[PDB]
Coordinates of N, CA, C and O (backbone and C1' of nucleotides) in Angstrom, one line a residue:
Chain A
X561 N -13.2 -3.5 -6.1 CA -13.4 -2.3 -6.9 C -12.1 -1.9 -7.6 O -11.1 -2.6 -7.5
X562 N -12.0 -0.4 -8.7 CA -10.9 -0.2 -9.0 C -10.8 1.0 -8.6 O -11.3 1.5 -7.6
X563 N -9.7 1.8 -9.7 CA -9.6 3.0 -8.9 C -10.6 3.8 -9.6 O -10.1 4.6 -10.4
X564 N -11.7 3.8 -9.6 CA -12.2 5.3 -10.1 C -11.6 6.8 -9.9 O -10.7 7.0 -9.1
X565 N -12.1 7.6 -10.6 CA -11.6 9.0 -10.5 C -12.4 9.3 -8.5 O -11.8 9.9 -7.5
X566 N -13.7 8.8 -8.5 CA -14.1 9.4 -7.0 C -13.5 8.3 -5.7 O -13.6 8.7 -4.6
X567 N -13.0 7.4 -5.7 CA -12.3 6.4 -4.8 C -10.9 7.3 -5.0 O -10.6 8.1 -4.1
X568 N -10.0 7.3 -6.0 CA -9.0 8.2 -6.1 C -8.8 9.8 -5.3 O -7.8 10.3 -4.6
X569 N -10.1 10.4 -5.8 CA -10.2 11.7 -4.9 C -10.6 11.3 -3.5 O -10.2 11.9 -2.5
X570 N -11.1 10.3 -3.4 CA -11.3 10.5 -1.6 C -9.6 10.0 -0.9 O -9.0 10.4 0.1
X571 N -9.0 9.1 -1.7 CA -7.6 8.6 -1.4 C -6.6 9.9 -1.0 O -6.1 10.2 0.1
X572 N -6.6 10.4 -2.0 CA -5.9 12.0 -1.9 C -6.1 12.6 -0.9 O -5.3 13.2 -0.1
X573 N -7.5 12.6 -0.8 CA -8.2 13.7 0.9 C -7.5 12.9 1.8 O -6.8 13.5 2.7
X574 N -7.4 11.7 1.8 CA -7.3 11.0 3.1 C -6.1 11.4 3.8 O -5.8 11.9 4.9
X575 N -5.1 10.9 2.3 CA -3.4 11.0 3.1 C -3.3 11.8 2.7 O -2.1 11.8 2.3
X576 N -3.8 13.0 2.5 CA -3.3 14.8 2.9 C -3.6 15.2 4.2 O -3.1 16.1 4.8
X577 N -5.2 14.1 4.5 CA -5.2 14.8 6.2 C -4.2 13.6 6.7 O -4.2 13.6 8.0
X578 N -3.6 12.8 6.2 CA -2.5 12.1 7.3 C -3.1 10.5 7.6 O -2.4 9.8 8.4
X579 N -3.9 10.2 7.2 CA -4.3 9.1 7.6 C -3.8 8.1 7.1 O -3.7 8.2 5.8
X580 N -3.2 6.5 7.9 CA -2.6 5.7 7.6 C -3.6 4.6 6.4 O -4.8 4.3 6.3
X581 N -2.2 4.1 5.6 CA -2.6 3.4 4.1 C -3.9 2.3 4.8 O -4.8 2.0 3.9
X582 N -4.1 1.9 6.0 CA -4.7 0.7 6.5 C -6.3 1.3 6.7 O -7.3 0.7 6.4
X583 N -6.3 2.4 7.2 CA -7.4 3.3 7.7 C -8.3 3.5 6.4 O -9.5 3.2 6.1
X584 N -7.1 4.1 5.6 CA -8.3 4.4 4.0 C -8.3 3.2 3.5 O -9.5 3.1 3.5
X585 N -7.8 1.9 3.0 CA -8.1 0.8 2.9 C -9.2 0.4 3.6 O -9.9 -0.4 2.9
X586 N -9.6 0.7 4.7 CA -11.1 0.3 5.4 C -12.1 1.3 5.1 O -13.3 1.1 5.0
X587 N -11.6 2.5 5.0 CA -12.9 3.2 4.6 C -13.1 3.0 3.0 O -14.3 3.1 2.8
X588 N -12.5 2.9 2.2 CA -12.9 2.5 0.6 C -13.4 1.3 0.6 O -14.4 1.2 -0.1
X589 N -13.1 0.4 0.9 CA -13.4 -0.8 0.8 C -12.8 -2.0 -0.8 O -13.0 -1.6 -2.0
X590 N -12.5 -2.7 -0.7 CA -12.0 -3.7 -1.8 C -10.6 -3.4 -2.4 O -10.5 -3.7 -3.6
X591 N -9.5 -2.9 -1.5 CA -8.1 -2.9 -1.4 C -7.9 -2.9 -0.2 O -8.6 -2.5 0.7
X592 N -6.5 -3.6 -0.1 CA -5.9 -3.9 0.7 C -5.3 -2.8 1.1 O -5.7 -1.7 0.5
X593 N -4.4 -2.6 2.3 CA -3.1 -1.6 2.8 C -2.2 -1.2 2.2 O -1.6 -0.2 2.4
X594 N -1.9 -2.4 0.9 CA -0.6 -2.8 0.1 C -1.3 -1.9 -1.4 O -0.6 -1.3 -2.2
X595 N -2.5 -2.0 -1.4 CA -3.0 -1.9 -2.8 C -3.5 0.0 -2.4 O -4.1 0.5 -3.3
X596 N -3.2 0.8 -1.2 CA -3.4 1.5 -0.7 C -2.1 2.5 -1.1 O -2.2 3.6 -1.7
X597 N -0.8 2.0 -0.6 CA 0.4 2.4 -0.8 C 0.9 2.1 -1.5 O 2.1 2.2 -1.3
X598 N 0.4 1.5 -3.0 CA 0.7 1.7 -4.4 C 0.5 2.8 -5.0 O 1.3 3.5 -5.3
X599 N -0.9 2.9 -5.1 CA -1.8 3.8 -5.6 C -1.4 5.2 -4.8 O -2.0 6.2 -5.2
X600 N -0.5 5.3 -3.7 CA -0.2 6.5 -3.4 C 1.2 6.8 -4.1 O 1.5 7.9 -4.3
X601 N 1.9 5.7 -4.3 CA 3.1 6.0 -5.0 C 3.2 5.9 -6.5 O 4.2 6.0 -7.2
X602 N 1.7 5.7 -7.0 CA 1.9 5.8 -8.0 C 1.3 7.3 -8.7 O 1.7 7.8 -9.7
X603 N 0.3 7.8 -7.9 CA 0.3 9.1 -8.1 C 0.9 10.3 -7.3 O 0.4 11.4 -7.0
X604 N 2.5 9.5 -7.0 CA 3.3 10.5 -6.5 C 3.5 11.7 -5.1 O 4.1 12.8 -4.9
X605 N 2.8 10.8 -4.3 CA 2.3 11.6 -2.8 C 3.7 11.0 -2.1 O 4.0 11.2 -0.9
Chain B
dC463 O5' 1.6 -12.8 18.6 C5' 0.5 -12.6 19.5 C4' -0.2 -11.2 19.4 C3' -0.8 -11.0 18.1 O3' -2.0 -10.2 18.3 C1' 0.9 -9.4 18.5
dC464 P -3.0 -9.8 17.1 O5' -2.4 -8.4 16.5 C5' -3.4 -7.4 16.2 C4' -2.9 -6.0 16.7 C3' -2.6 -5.0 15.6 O3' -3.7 -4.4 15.1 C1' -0.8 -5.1 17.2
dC465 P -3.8 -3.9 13.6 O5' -2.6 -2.9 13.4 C5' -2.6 -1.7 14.0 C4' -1.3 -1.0 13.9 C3' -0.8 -0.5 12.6 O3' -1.5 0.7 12.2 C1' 1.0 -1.4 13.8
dT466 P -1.5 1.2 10.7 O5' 0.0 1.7 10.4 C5' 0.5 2.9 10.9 C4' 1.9 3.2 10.4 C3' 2.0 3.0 8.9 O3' 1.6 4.2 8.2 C1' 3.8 2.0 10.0
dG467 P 1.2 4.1 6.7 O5' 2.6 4.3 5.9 C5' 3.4 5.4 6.1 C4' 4.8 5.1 5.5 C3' 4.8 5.0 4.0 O3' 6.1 5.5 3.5 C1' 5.5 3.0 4.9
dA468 P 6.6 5.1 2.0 O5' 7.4 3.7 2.3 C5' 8.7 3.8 2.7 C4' 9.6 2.9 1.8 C3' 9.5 3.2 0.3 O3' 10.7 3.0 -0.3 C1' 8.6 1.0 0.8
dT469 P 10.9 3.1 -1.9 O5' 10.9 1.6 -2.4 C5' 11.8 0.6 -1.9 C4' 11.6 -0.7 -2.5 C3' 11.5 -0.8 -4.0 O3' 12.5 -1.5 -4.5 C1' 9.7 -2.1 -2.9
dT470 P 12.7 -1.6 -6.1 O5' 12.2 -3.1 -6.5 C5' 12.6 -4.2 -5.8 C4' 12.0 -5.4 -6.3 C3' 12.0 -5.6 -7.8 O3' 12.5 -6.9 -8.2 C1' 9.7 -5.8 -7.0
dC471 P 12.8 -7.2 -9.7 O5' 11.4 -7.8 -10.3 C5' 10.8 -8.9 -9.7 C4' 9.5 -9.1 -10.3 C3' 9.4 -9.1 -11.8 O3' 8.6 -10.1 -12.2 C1' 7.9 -7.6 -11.0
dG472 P 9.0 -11.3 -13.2 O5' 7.8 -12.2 -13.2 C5' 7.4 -12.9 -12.0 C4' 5.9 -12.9 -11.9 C3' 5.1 -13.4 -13.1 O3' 4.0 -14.2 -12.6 C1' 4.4 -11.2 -12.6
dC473 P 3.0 -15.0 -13.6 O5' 1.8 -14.0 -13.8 C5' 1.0 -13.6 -12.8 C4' 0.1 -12.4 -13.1 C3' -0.6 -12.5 -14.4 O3' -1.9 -13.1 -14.3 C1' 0.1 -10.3 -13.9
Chain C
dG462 P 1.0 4.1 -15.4 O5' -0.2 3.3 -14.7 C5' -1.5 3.3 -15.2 C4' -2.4 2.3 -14.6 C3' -2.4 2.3 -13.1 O3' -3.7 1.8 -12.7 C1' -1.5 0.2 -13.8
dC463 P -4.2 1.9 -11.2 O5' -3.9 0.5 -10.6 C5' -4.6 -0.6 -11.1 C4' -4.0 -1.9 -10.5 C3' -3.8 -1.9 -9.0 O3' -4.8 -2.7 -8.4 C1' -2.0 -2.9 -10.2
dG464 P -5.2 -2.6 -6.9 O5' -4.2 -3.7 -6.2 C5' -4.3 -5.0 -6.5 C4' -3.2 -5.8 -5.9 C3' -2.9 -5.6 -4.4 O3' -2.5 -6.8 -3.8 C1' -1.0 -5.1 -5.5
dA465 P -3.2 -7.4 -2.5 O5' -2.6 -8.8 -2.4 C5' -2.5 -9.7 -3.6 C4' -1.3 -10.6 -3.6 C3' -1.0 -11.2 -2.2 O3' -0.4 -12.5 -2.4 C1' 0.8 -9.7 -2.8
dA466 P 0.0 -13.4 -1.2 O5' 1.5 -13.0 -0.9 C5' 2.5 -13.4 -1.9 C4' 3.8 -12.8 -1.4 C3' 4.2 -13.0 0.0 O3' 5.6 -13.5 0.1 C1' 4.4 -10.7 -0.5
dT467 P 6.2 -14.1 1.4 O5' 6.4 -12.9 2.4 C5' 7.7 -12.5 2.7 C4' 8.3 -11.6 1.5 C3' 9.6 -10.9 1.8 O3' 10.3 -10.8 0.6 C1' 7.9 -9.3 1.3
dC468 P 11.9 -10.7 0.6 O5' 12.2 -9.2 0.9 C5' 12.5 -8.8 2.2 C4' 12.6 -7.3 2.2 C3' 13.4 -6.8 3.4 O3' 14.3 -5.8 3.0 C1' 11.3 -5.8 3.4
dA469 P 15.6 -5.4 3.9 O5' 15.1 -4.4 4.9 C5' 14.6 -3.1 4.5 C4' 14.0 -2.3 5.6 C3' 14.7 -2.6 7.0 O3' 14.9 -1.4 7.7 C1' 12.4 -2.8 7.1
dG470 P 16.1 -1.3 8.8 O5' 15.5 -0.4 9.9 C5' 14.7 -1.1 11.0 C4' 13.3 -0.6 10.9 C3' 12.7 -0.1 12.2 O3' 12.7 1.3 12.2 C1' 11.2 -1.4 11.0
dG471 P 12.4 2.1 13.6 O5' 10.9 1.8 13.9 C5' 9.8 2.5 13.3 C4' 8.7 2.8 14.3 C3' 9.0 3.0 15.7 O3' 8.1 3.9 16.3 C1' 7.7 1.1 15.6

DNA sequence: CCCTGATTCGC
DNA sequence: GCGAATCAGG
């Protein structure tokens, strides 16, 4: 998958409640851990 | 051997 | 913008 605007909002929820890049990587499905902790540094969390 | 985030740069 | 393959550890 890519990043939609709703895969993106649920990313946000996730690691605001704290949950590890590997965890929301399994709950989205079709990124890795690595493609998890991009996408958080890339919108600056 | 399970796990954590951080970084580079070809794509 | 994206993320594999490291890096650097726990």
């Amino acid at each position: 998958m890519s990043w939609t605007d709703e895969r993106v909002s649920t990313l946000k929820k996730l690691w605001l409640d704290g949950l590890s890049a590997s965890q929301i990587a399994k709950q989205l499905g079709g990124v890795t851990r690595n493609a998890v902790i991009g996408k958080v540094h890339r919108l600056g969390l």
